[PDB]
Design a binder for this molecule. Structure first.
Ligand SMILES: *C(=O)CCCCCCCCCCCCC
Ligand SMILES: *C(=O)CCCCCCCCCCCCC
Ligand SMILES: *C(=O)CCCCCCCCCCCCC
Ligand SMILES: *C(=O)CCCCCCCCCCCCC
Ligand SMILES: *C(=O)CCCCCCCCCCCCC
Lengths: 20, 350, 350, 350, 20, 20, 350, 350, 20, 20, 20
């Protein structure tokens, strides 16, 4: 299980879009 | 039907005519846009629902109807300096041209000296995103309910030659009844054929976008794969700390499926998170029907879902009568509009 | 159907015949009442379920069938002194004459020297009232489920020339399966035409009742408006501390709808909480079908709901095997019945 | 249908043909068994899911498909010493011969020097048992959903001349979608006629089994009565500390129904927990249709349930991505298989 | 929001009927 | 148990003061 | 101490001096009142916290300190017409004169042409009332924590010759730390001796008040009995539908204690809900110390509680950053103050 | 103190005298038993709290005091036939002789023609057992609170030459305040020295009991090890399906500690679940003080716990005013006592 | 209510099968 | 983890005492 | 209330450290 990895990245919050 | 019987025959007969009336229609509004449909005095401002880069979203009450909308207010100067003129203009055109159960409705649009205003329907249940993160993961029935709705939304968008380009939980608003409403048509493009822009959220980029090779509507079926996976699993299939590492992983495409994924779920996902576009579902001969007739979808009646007549697994009950609490008790601003008209010719087509 | 197809045609064809068989039938029982159907030794007393102004409600077990009922026991003297003889007599007649899924069934009735006994079906889930107050507000799907059931209950009652006169959450008992059962037919009146009595709960009074001008079956569609609003909102549309202030507000009829109410919900409510009876839904040309065919009801199949075959949003699971805990572990009384028959000629028709 | 209309006619027409294709089919696999379908190197071992008397259950991943199964591993010597050779052999034959939505699927079977391996589909939601004990009791809609599925499972098993002999919550696994899957076919017997073995769990023994008088498929409809009662009540109808006292009570058959049981539920149960087999439902002239057409089942469409297209009341969300936590973080063993083949001729038919 | 008003009245409990 | 009585009266909400 | 050791000796030595410094002090402010301590421009208005008979309570931010208070605004005309001039005037005097941990602090007071403003400390956790009704009942430790605080509050108030006259959960606000703060000193009276006014809430009336015989500070110890009972039980000792029936029951004083009440709790309550004032605790020779040294209070250190240094059982976490949601997103008014000074000589002493 | 300072000195000085006054006292009641303290008419029967092998436990209200007790009723004939005469007689003697905060109090005892009645204090929170099984496991602070109380209970019992012989969660009742009360003194023995009976629950048997070698008070410190482990872990250290396998494991003594056990908890447990009695804590030179002064107990003040003045982690709030729901709404019996005195000389000493 | 009886027996856990 | 073992035995319910 | 702002930034997840 990578879910524990998941929580540890900052990427558990609102992801924005690279862009345009 | 979904497959009522060989009433699947009537499903398809019907889908067919429906979508034909739909192109006729979009093409008219697309090619002759409706424009400047109202003005600010028509609306009481209730509260600030949020605040962005081009400005606020406000809860507003239209004074004739006694109905509530969410008003996105954009300062012309700010959009001009942020170089968002064409994205803004494009989102509005798309939005005033399109019409489906699951897309959020642009109710009115107008500008004034300072600001552009896009008044949309207010969908108080919020995004799927936070619900998903508070609940953790969604049961394959809950997650399939939503999948069914997006398949239909993409069948329609793609027939109008529109690639959405930005699927993720944060643009899927859940309404009063428990059905999806997709927001943010700022990266959608009406493209017949192939395009080249780097756009979306890293997590949901299809390998072709990352590779800069040109791409088409097949990117949205790869993002439906990323979406069903994150709903049914909790977390995305490819995620990392740095975006370039997320990309790292996406262009290898090596996904590990959770053990609680059904053999059936795993196998729908194996052909939506396909790297070879000659094998990606929704991009083969049998278009969407390769997806729509997969055994994970076997118990789904596509007309029932369209018709909004299935019973929704979860309906959000955001708290706070009038003004909520989550939406937010912000410090309220003035909306100032100036003695002079700023940016007139850039936003002239709006 | 609700609108199956133009099987809406069969819906209506059917409703039509149904209701015709129904008048025939009610009229027979109404005009020749069934009377004194059992006696007290036939029932084991389990516990006191509650206690009122005319006496107790008891959980009882009918000894031949091994089935449970709730026994309302009324002391003749108490009803006579409280001047409730005619309300009592009237409730019983109505109740033994009527027959619908969603009305609570009067299983047996008898008197004895002291007391009148109305043995009803036991609906353990309790009233909607407390559930509503513990949960806070109900999602528009949950709230529409119940709305659908009451529309049907009122279509039937009104065809039998019965104005219910007392809708609110406290008379809507939720059963085993999750469907409504309406209790308390003590203010219902069989009135063809117009009447003048001040009756109901303040919150639910239609402006005409308050105004003493005479009124008809249109008061019950105003109380369906008060009901859908309190289910979908948490609180009544007009409420105050003093009743006379509630009235104050009702005869102005100025309602503010919550922002989470759907545009669609608000607009059903605008024509049920109508003050002009020439504009109130259910009281226009198109009778109930103005209500039944409103877009809030769009996903409702009226036959499915009648047939009890929809899946219920919420089923109460009151705790306590046999005797519960909420129902209550009271101090148990004797039921004493006397050596002499009290009030014989007043309750003679019972 | 369940009773669609007189499409009940098509229900029954269809059930009829279905079951005919089913005997043909079972009889072929039954009478010519499929045998030794794979080998151990084909599977990655993930974790121990559990540990038994003949050995472990393991979560395994089949390397070609990337699919997950639960591997029951049985040490030949242990089964031989526990005198379970014939139960083992019998379970496997039954299992490789049978095919229904609600039975758990034996995906592969093989032996090797030491162990017999029965690789089944992995159903992560676990048994109904613990869910039932954590939740306490199930609403009569939830409890009827499951009842409907078992009626169908027994209609099919009994047509193949198979008496299941071991119903209880611990063999009813709830899958991804919320539907039952019955496990453990180690006491099932293909018996045309009557048999004499003492087998089941005490609580669920029908009076004939206890009495040693000979018995038939009618024992499984008595165990459906014990099951609906424990689902809808919390606890079994007859239970005691000592089994011989449970028996004590079962052969009297004096059941007290909870007051929240519906009159209707009580009366289905009165004829499934029947002691006279000439009055027990499922064992009369009208076979299952006495059960299938009882008013508790009135809102059930039997084809919808078969088709897995009803919406499930509850879907378990066991926690722990990959490896869970409840399933368990055990001390992992080796699976050792020997340089020599143990028990070869006993397990020769496997 | 009047809901705060609502809670503050005594009329959050079982409402009886004026009458008769 | 009178608690069941309790719930049934309207006096489960905010009680005001007779007065003055 | 509570009884540290014979440090009980230091408890009492200390209480003694404390209360002496306290009379000196109150008497000075009482007999020479502080008056008109600030003005409206000093405060930013944030939101309406509530609305009453004499006007609104508002969340306000004092601009020099950046601190939050709750502003009760009273329209002079409204108080004059409601004949509340003397209650208003009296509450303010009491409030600016008194000083204890558990009384809510009147931070500033001023009038202006229209309105009187009493700016109090903001205690966001709300009343004990609703918490009590949502939780149901409080454990005898939780309930004793609060009891301890009120005993101390009444020991102090009564030494200043103040009978509170209005105890119930709705005036006991729970703060940030989890300690009580008593609000509403509008029925308190500084009376040496006996008085005659009918005042309180029915439920909490001591039999003497009802009987119109004259009464003293002993009414507040009867209301501590009603309070500990409703905290530890869920509901009041005497309650009914009609107040006159509550009275009915109070002047008989026949209380039934819940079976989960400890023998010890029951016996504290038997002497606080005493009808004979010659036997009522707090009114005997041993004043409060009859209450303070009861075995229910045995584990209470009275100085620890005073010192606010015990750990609170429950701290409310009302939701909504800034503006909350429960407090409420109301329709905001203007506070208008007039070109002319209304009611000048009546409110002259304020 | 626990170790206040070298006020540990006063702790021990005090414990010392306390226990001396305690032997004096027990010895008097032990050697001259109090006998037949009341009669049945003195008690109103409220409800059946439970039902056993020798009869019912009832909630009873003593009519003079208005206090509630739990009445264990034992039918003399049943105890005589179950050969429980001496266990019964012994439990009563022990119970009327002993006096500690944490032992449950035998309030009155009497017999009558049929039955023996032991009226105990009613502790409504129930056993620790079910709470433990619903919560799952207890935090090492919660679990140490209870440990502290049992250490003290055993220090006292053992000084009176009493080996308890039956520790487990099912005899540890949690009261109103959140403190333990030990029930069931039917296997306790006053033994100076060593004894030989096989008694307890399998899980909690110390290896010596199983081995039949003779045993002493050191069995209770091995059962404190089993207890702290099951509280802090969820499950017992040695458990199996068959008791003989539990024994199997106990006489090897190979325990695996959970990873969330603190190094400190593990090491207290290593010397209470000691197999060598020359190394088992509580059985070495330093008696209990080896346990009482272990670093897991480091933050425990033993006098505070005795004095009941620590704040309890958890207080049960069993539901149901008067009569509960869990306790149970049973079918109420008569208690019949006969025209003749049954078993007179056997129970003569009672 | 026998449910209280129920909880008190050991038969609230996983029931095995007599057998064979 | 043996906790999964634990749940699977019938010994998760009220344990009585061998005896006497 | 900025809390609504808070949720909308990606900075609701695990924050790492600029660095070194
Ligand atoms: C099959 O049941 C009956 C066919 C009636 C279905 C109505 C057609 C609606 C099709 C619109 C599909 C939209 C998806 C892009
Ligand atoms: C439409 O689907 C099929 C029509 C079958 C419906 C049965 C008719 C029942 C009508 C009774 C309505 C009761 C409301 C007062
Ligand atoms: C009635 O609606 C339509 C008939 C279509 C039903 C499909 C037949 C499936 C029958 C299998 C039943 C299995 C139970 C043992
Ligand atoms: C006993 O521990 C030490 C004494 C120190 C206590 C401080 C005195 C505070 C007394 C004020 C009591 C207020 C109640 C009206
Ligand atoms: C240390 O703080 C102060 C000593 C006062 C403690 C009172 C003595 C109580 C000892 C009884 C212990 C009971 C355990 C068997």
């Amino acid at each position: 299980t990578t879910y524990a990895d998941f929580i540890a990245s900052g990427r558990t919050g609102r992801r924005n879009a690279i862009h345009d | 039907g979904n497959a009522a019987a060989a009433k699947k025959g009537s499903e398809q007969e019907s889908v067919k005519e429906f979508l034909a009336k739909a192109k006729e229609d979009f093409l008219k509004k697309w090619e002759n846009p409706a424009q400047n449909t109202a003005h600010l005095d028509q609306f009481e401002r209730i509260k600030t629902l949020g605040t962005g880069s081009f400005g606020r979203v406000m809860l507003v009450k239209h004074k004739e109807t006694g109905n509530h909308f969410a008003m996105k207010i954009l300062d012309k100067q700010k959009v001009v300096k942020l170089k968002q003129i064409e994205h803004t203009l494009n989102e509005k055109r798309i939005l005033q041209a399109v019409n489906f159960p699951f897309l959020v409705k642009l109710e009115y649009s107008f500008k004034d000296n300072s600001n552009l205003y896009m008044v949309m329907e207010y969908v108080p249940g919020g995004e799927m995103f936070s619900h998903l993160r508070r609940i953790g993961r969604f049961s394959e029935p809950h997650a399939r309910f939503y999948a069914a709705q997006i398949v239909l939304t993409f069948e329609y968008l793609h027939s109008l030659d529109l690639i959405y380009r930005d699927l993720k939980p944060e643009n899927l608003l859940i309404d009063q009844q428990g059905y999806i409403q997709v927001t943010d048509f700022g990266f959608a493009k009406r493209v017949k054929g192939r395009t080249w822009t780097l756009c979306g959220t890293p997590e949901y980029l299809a390998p072709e976008i990352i590779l800069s090779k040109g791409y088409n509507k097949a990117v949205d079926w790869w993002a439906l794969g990323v979406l069903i996976y994150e709903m049914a699993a909790g977390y995305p299939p490819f995620f990392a700390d740095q975006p370039i590492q997320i990309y790292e992983k996406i262009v290898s495409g090596k996904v590990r499926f959770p053990s609680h994924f059904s053999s059936d779920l795993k196998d729908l996902l194996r052909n939506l998170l396909q790297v070879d576009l000659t094998k990606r579902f929704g991009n083969l001969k049998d278009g969407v029907n390769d997806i729509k007739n997969h055994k994970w979808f076997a118990t789904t009646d596509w007309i029932a879902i369209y018709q909004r007549k299935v019973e929704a697994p979860f309906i959000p009950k955001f708290k706070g009568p009038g003004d909520t609490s989550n939406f937010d008790d912000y410090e309220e601003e003035e909306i100032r509009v100036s003695i002079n008209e700023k940016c007139g010719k850039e936003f002239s087509e709006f």
